[PDB]
């Protein structure tokens, strides 16, 4: 077995507890997003109508 801590060099977990930290996974996963936003809008208006009809 391994004891309270193990023996002293430390032993070996050097290699266990570095090629672990952790399983890694690693979750190449669960992002979220800023999305992006569109822009608005082209006029100045023109008259024919509506000046005469009001």
């Amino acid at each position: 077995c391994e004891e309270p801590p193990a023996p002293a060099p430390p032993p070996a977990k050097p290699k266990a507890a570095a090629a672990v930290p952790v399983k890694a996974a690693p979750t190449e996963t669960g992002a979220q997003a800023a999305p992006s936003y569109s822009y608005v809008y082209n006029p100045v208006g023109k008259r024919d109508p509506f000046r005469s009809p009001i």
Binding site: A6, P7, P11, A12, K15, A18
Partner: protein, 57 residues
Amino acid sequence: MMIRINLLPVRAVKKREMGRQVLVLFAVVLIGAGVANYLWYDDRQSELEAHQAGVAS
């Protein structure tokens, strides 16, 4: 007629005896040091297996 034989007494005797004892002591010391070299070898093989487990990790 007297037939006498001073063969194996004594500075010959007790120097063959001291010669034996010194060598027995040598043998004991070297067997103990052997056992030490061993037990060391076993702790080292255990460490090697732990480290190879880490390398697999």
